[model samples]
Target: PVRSLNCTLRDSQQKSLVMSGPYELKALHLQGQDMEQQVVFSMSFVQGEESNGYIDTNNDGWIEGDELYDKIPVALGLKEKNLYLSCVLKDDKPTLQLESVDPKNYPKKKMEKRFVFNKIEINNKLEFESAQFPNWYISTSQAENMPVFLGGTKGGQDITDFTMQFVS
Candidate 1:
């Protein structure tokens, strides 16, 4: 039972997906499916600064290449504490869950790949794939506020590409 631990970041024009300032993550496919509807589901990025754990090894507000080898602690969420994303096998079926991590005891959870998602950026669009699961990319259904899950492949046909619109 082994998958090659070769989850390296691909050649990307953008060096990092860890954007500065607060922002909303909107899926590009959502816009196309809804015919440019603004009602698409948006989510937040938990910066390495927020530290349920640390990702930016250099503290330079960016993460890239060697720094991204599944060693960084990260999360995705809808409403801060209410929803931090997770993936688990439910009845031997791959499932996504919103498992909250208490910062008070996050150290016990440091080595958990369940919380870390290695960002794969290309052509300025960001795709977050699970560090533990090789093929599952973070994506959502067409409906608003649908359960976010790992239903995407690297084929680029799924609704996995996103733009992190930096806020003022």
Candidate 2:
């Protein structure tokens, strides 16, 4: 089920994630495995940016404790919280899709873009696929002053993963 809600920008050092080298992002993907459990997959999206780097560092993807979380340590020996991204495997091509988008702002179909990676850890690397291919800057959160995705939905079955699937 999907639900809509507001979240505050809490990560303090997200900026360090940007770099000239390859970048990799990890997210928890859920899939019904079998009786009482789900095969929780920690999927990694690896992409590379240009020498100059892609994605607007100044836009929603980058902010002080708002978007980018630099190398900062937490008191509880934690680095950061888990981030969820709404990605689409459209026509066998992986594309990041934003949840409920405003039609007025993005009159075009492609205009409905939102940078999906929000929950991030400090000091992690970043990446892009092709230097020739332009980046589709999308956001999970619209803007500090604007509204966010309508993450609303209902109805879902509870399941747990089978122990055999736990082995990596």
Candidate 3:
């Protein structure tokens, strides 16, 4: 007779197995002829204080420590539309999705618009590099104090602006 076991699984990094968290699980201690089994599943956790990563879900332009994962939408300041950034699955792969919502009548379904972009770190500076455009990047010009636009360098050879910082 096979008996159930209560386990608190942990990853190699010693992190607890939380819902929606990614980790590898392996079977062990199976005896006798052969107890063949495979486990492949994905879990999702609710947004709360203990969660990892910070996001501006409320569209207030601030990342609260208690906020949920970065999967939530974040309004990029100065955009005409109520635009936000979200990490979404595109083409069966993970990519940054630049989405928008109607400030007056925000519909959940209409937020699926794909404005794919890449958020990466270069020279220790964070920048949002456009996926569609060859070398355009999102930048906030300081002249007007708050005018964000897609600015790029010539020939896609070098990027001069579009630097951002994270504030706790």
Candidate 4:
């Protein structure tokens, strides 16, 4: 039951993936697709028994290994907006959703799994693998103003990679 990123980071390159508090998650575009790059798809953790999605288990303020972050449960949303990301079942398949679920409801039984995601850090950029769907990641379409979904990966033509910005 030990899900692992199966690797470690260098002392210098291990800073970006620290999951501590409210931070903006921006979709990192490929080449000329970098327009409107300031969009704020942010993450704010749900608390209690499961704990806030704190990646630095040892309080070292950094993420370095795979085992420490098998999966960190969290509620994702847009920083300046009032929307939260969700993973749901559609057509018997795991799908993504974004709605105005009060942050207070994140710990409720219904939101626990669907509102969760595994923070898979890849050095600088990071990937959000859905907790409800496992390997399926949170991603968006090539067109603007699209619905974010789960079917992406670190590799492939999917729009999965995102960068975290300091918003605290």
Q: Kindly list the per-residue Cα lDDT of model 2 for residues 57-135, writing each as its tens digit.
A: 5576554533343321111000122233344555654454323333243222121123222222322332211111223
Model 1 TM-score relative to the real fold: 0.49
- The TM-score ranking, best first, is 4, 1, 3, 2
Q: All candidates' lDDT scores?
A: 0.45, 0.24, 0.34, 0.51
- The sequence of per-residue lDDT tens digits that candidate 3 reaches over residues 11-129 is 22222212211112222322333322212111112121221365565788886554544222212321233444433446654443335556564323222323434444333334445
RMSD of each: 12.3, 18.4, 22.6, 10.6
* Consecutive 10-residue window with the lowest summed lDDT within model 4: 2-11
Q: What TM-score number comes out for model 2?
A: 0.18
List model 1 lDDT by residue over 12-53, tens digit each. 221112211132223222333443233212233333322122
By lDDT, the better pick of 1 and 4 is: 4
- Candidate 2 vs candidate 4, lDDT winner: 4
Off by over 4 Å in 2: 1-36, 48-119, 122-167
Question: What TM-score, over all chains together, does every model reach?
Answer: 0.49, 0.18, 0.30, 0.54
Each model's number of backbone clashes?
Answer: 0, 28, 1, 0
The 10 consecutive residues of candidate 2 with the worst lDDT sum are 71-80
Best by lDDT: 4
Off by over 4 Å in 1: 1-73, 77-83, 106-111, 143-145, 152-157
